[PDB]
Design a protein around this nucleic acid. Structure first.
Lengths: 732, 368
RNA sequence: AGAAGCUGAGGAGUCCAGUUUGACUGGAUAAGGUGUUCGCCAUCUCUAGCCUCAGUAAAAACUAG
DNA sequence: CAAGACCAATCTTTACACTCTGTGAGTATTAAAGTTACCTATAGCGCCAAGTGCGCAAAGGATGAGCTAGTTTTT
């Protein structure tokens, strides 16, 4: 039961301290060199404990002259066992004379009673120092203490990548050292006589055979461990994943009646295993762990209160981490190594305990994958996933592909708590401006959401002294508080703003909240997708959709086209002809040359009619953008959608015109108009393909994309710069 | 790092000495008309003018040059991440404690030692023609010819911005020597500025013997340093350093504790008692604290009885906030290392609660 | 030798000690009690143990729950 | 008062010269290719010229405003 491990100036460590160990400690990270160095440090310390000749470790820097390894052992249970008046034995008295004798004879009669016998925890500290001349020194100059500590807190290391299934040495080592039997009372002669009596035709034949064999094979006598192993083997009835399972089960079972607490390290438990196999392994370990637990009403024979040993895992599989988090819960922790700016291993704790039972039950592989990331982007809606995960868009920016995007709500963000592991896993939370400010039409005043109030309270810092450069934050907070009323004026019947633009306020709040890892977009995703500079591309995409997806419903195209041309007017009745001729179909048949020409002429006439109507009904060319981004489930300027406007009963003419456009001409676009339909991916792919065809150079196409889409490109560039700043540290 | 001609041409000297480079003129030294002569007891502090070519060069050297040369971990002063608590922490594992001080640490730093220490990191070339070298040009911005100490020549004076880094770089060699000496004896060594702390975890009288003092003096004599015989302390099982008490009853595998004396907290307790007894803020800020608003500092009369009150309120709240910050720094140090007595933790928690309540009361009274 | 010592200049009242009939000099208020490695140390309790003026440069850590 | 104990790295290796192609006895005796080769970065605030600056610190309207600044250690 180790509590603290400290390493100073060794290998890749400057000053690293590990504490607050649990039963199911798990180690993850990108810097495998740090894990290897930690394992080497532990093995070196335990080899020097047992007086073995090994090579001393190297120094991180040569401007020092010492390297220290410090270990702290929680010697509380052993003290309670030994100091009791009931236990009178050789081993107990020897342990007291070795561990608790020196530290207790220097205390008076006041500290011993009622001050160290109620709830105190006893600690033992051992320090190992390596000098510049390859000299090794101990803080305690007594080999007996080191031997007792080694035999009371054994260390076991398991490597699964290179493991031999034909060797059972760890199993026998665990069995031999976790028994409460004295095997020296079994005399050889009586056992030989018993075996001879059991199998013999003439008395004494087996004994004579054994004597003749021994007289020829005379070698060194058996040691105690060999004798106990032979006795166990003759007693039992028989002899990668299975070996590890057996080791863990034996370790858990045999320690329930002993005061020896081993420490186990396991490397890559999931090598060459199915995910279901790893999940079953963790589940079986948890079931065996819970079988021997005696807490509260759970009592009876076979249930104990003995503490469990410490287990460390080195894994690269999200499945094992997910199972460990879901099953063990409060009895586990997650460690992250990473590096530093100049190059040095770190150790941080990642939050893995959740107070929400729904989150634990709904825990899946995406949450575990969030652990194995170097930059997380949190978004609310499902359109952000469709926009940021586009393959063509990420092809041109080989720096945002190293970040993972996750959909999280307020409760999900609170449960995850990304701020705890801020130095290990950088993150950014992207939200909309509507989450902070709410605008109304009937009452000409803004309002502040509770999230804005919480952010203001967090930014406000009482109990502080003066600091230059901090008064600006206070002034901004005061302005945000006083902008509560903010009387304004809306034109076009509560549709636009006189002069606010929602841009200066957004920039100021972004500057204020950058310290909290937040970014508030001026508009929604659909607002950024279609802007005043993207109208030609949107129109071209609509035209391509009309040209391709629209096909003749009738199996015979020529006869149907001729009949509908002779039945409906080509100019005045173009809309009914388009509605009754062309339909959306997955398969696009190839027609004759004359039929293709007629279809192309009809499509061109329809395109001309729609563009003329669009440019005639609306004049300022901004209401076109507003209608386009509002029909695709969006809000603009006033933060109002179709349902909100209908409930508010405002802008009747605009809503009626939009309804007429939807139900009269753009009937084919309607299925690709609801939320989470797939128009974002198609539009992005078409735009990227067009710009790639037009411009060959990567710089030119990137510049054109930045010009067409300012906001999303700015977000991507900022994330890429943040990743590049911390690329060296978060990379093995 | 290796500074060459272009580095000094662009980074170290961007605009202050650009006029003297094209004209092929030697970089002047710091004259006696640009440095003040502040006095405090038997100590002399040299202050340079805030508007001078050398001040900007010193700041640039401190930020870009004197921040990458490796140091020794035994030095925990004037280094990022270092603190007095980290200077006292390693000695909790020891049973015997010894303290030593260096006499005239900054005044005894030889200039040639500084030049030799900084030579490997500066390219050997002539900055200005064939008259002045780059190393000499850089070093002329850190030294000063003291009129009162003309016998010793020119030294690096206390009060300049680049002095602590130069001191650490110079004393790195001595720190290495002392650490190597102490490692063989099993003694933990730490240094803060010119104070050395030694701790022995074993049961022995090595730190109470004259042999240790003789060895330290012999080591320090290589570079011309001396110890102060009036500040030598050697004790067992308990030591007090400026109100910080380190205790360890002894024994194998024993861990000590660090606390603060009652005298260390006397002033804050007196201030809290006076504030709870409704004492005027003028008396509290003048008697207990040493803050006083002189009438000469007043520039414009305007209104009289409104700026003194707010000045005193701000000074009181700043003092309370600073002491609260100090106490919670102690709490954070405990959380990181867990080497603080529990009763002291309870006491400081109560004191922090009382201080926060007093600050809230002061703010409410000011608002009313 | 050497090394410290010290941010200074003071003033009013009171006490002690010395010289001295009449003034001067020296020491002194973050109090009292307890234990001490006797340290300019630790700990405990109050009602918290005098006033005025000058001077105050640099580098690091700390705004938690 | 003097005193053994006087850092690490400074880029890294590798290697005979002559006329003779096998052998060499200086009072004080490395060096030239190859492969790299590293990063330093900013302070009150606002404004217009958009960072190379200018103004101002009363608004404001170009020189009345008004104007504080933490603890501890070294020292």
């Amino acid at each position: 039961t180790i509590e603290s491990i400290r390493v100073k100036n060794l290998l890749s460590f400057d000053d690293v301290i590990l504490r607050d160990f649990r039963d199911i400690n798990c180690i993850i990270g990108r810097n495998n060199v740090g894990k290897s160095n930690l394992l080497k440090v532990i093995r070196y310390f335990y080899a020097k404990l047992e007086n073995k000749k090994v090579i001393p470790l190297d120094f991180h820097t040569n401007y020092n002259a010492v390297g220290e390894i410090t270990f702290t052992f929680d010697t509380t249970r052993i003290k309670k066992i030994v100091t009791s008046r009931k236990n009178n034995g050789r081993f107990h008295k020897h342990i007291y004379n070795t561990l608790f004798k020196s530290s207790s004879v220097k205390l008076n009669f006041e500290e011993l009673i009622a001050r160290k016998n109620s709830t105190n925890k006893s600690f033992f500290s051992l320090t190992l120092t390596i000098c510049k001349d390859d000299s090794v020194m101990w803080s305690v100059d007594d080999p007996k203490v080191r031997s007792l500590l080694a035999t009371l807190y054994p260390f076991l290391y398991i490597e699964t990548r290179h493991i031999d299934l034909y060797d059972w040495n760890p199993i026998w080592k665990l069995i031999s050292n976790l028994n409460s039997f004295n095997f020296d009372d079994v005399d050889h002669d009586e056992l030989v006589n018993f075996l001879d009596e059991k199998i013999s035709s003439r008395k004494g034949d087996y004994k004579k055979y054994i004597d003749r064999v021994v007289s020829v094979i005379d070698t060194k006598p058996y040691t105690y461990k060999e004798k106990v192993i032979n006795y166990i083997k003759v007693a039992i009835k028989g002899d990668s994943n299975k070996f590890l399972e057996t080791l863990l089960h034996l370790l858990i079972t045999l320690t329930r009646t002993e005061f020896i607490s081993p420490i186990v390290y396991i490397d890559e438990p999931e090598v060459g295993l199915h995910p279901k196999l790893a999940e079953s392994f963790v589940s079986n370990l948890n079931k065996i762990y819970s079988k021997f637990k005696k807490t509260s009403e759970l009592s009876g024979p076979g249930r104990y209160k003995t503490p469990y040993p410490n287990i460390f895992y080195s894994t690269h599989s999200p499945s094992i981490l997910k199972q460990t988090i879901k099953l063990f819960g409060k009895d586990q922790q997650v460690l992250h190594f990473s590096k530093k700016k100049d190059g040095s291993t770190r150790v941080n704790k990642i939050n893995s305990t959740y107070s929400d039972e729904r989150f634990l039950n709904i825990f899946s592989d995406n949450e575990a994958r969030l652990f194995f990331s170097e930059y997380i982007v949190f978004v609310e809606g499902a359109t952000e996933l469709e926009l940021f995960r586009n393959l063509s868009l990420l092809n041109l920016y080989p720096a945002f592909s190293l970040a993972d995007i996750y959909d999280a709500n307020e409760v999900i963000l609170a449960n995850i708590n990304p701020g705890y592991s801020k130095a290990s896993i950088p993150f950014v939370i992207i939200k909309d401006i509507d989450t902070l400010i709410d605008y109304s039409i009937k009452t000409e005043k803004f309002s502040l959401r509770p999230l804005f109030e919480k952010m203001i309270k967090e930014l406000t810092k009482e109990f502080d002294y003066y600091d230059t450069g901090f008064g600006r934050v206070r002034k901004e907070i005061d302005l945000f508080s006083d902008i509560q009323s903010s009387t304004k004026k809306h034109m076009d019947s509560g549709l636009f703003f006189k002069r606010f633009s929602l841009h200066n306020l957004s920039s100021r709040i972004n500057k204020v909240s950058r310290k909290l890892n937040r970014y508030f977009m001026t508009t929604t995703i659909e607002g950024a997708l279609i802007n005043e500079q993207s109208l030609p591309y949107f129109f071209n995409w609509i035209g391509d959709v009309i040209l391709t997806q629209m096909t003749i419903n009738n199996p015979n195209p020529d006869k149907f086209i001729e009949a509908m041309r002779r039945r409906y007017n080509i100019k005045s009745q173009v809309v009914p002809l388009f509605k009754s001729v062309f339909c959306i179909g997955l398969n696009h048949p190839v027609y004759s040359s004359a039929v293709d020409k007629q279809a192309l002429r009809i499509k061109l006439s329809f395109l001309n009619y729609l563009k003329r109507k669009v440019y005639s009904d609306f004049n300022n060319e901004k209401e076109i953008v507003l209608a386009l981004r509002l029909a695709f489930g969006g809000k603009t300027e006033t933060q109002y959608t179709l349902d909100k406007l209908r409930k508010d009963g405002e802008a009747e003419l605009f809503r009626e015109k939009i309804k007429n456009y939807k139900n009269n001409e753009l009937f084919f676009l309607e299925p690709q108009m609801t939320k989470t339909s797939g128009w974002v991916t198609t539009f992005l792919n078409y735009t990227i393909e067009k710009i790639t065809s037009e411009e060959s150079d990567d710089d030119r196409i990137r510049q054109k994309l930045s010009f067409i889409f300012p906001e999303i490109i700015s977000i991507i560039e900022q994330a890429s710069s943040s990743i590049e700043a911390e690329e060296s540290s978060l990379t093995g | 790092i290796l500074v060459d001609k272009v580095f000094y041409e662009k980074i170290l000297s961007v605009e202050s000495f650009k006029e003297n480079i094209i004209t092929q003129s030697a970089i002047p030294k710091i004259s006696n008309k640009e440095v003040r002569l502040i006095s405090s007891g038997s100590k002399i502090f040299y202050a340079i003018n805030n508007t001078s070519p050398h001040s900007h060069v010193q700041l640039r050297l401190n930020r870009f040059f004197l921040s990458h040369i490796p140091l020794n971990s035994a030095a925990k002063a004037f280094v990022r991440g270092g603190s007095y608590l980290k200077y006292l922490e390693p000695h909790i594992y020891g049973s015997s404690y010894c303290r030593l001080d260096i006499s005239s640490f900054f005044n005894n730093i030889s200039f040639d030692d500084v030049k030799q220490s900084l030579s490997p990191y500066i390219k050997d070339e002539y900055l200005i023609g064939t008259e002045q070298k780059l190393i000499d040009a850089i070093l002329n911005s850190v030294g000063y010819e003291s009129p009162i100490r003309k016998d010793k020549g020119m030294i690096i004076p206390m009060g300049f911005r680049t002095s602590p880094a130069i001191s650490n770089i110079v004393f790195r060699k001595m720190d290495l020597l002392i650490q190597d000496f102490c490692a063989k004896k099993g003694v933990i060594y730490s240094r803060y500025a010119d104070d050395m702390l030694f701790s022995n975890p074993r049961e022995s009288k090595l730190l109470m013997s004259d042999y240790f003092i003789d060895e330290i003096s012999s080591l320090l004599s290589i570079m011309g340093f001396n110890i102060n015989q009036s500040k030598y302390i050697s004790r067992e099982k308990e030591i007090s350093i400026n109100g910080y008490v380190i205790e360890n009853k002894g024994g194998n595998g024993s861990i000590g504790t660090i606390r603060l004396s009652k005298s260390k907290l006397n002033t804050v307790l007196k201030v809290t008692h006076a504030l709870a007894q409704n004492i005027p803020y003028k008396n509290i800020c003048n008697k207990y604290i040493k803050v006083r608003l002189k009438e000469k500092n007043i520039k414009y009369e305007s209104k009289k009885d409104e700026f003194e009150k707010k000045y005193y309120r701000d000074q009181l709240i700043n003092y309370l906030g600073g002491y609260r910050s100090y106490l919670i720094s102690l709490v954070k140090f405990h959380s990181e290392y867990k080497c603080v007595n529990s009763d002291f933790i309870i006491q400081i928690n109560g004191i922090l609660n009382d201080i926060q309540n007093h600050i809230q009361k002061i703010k409410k009274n000011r608002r009313l």
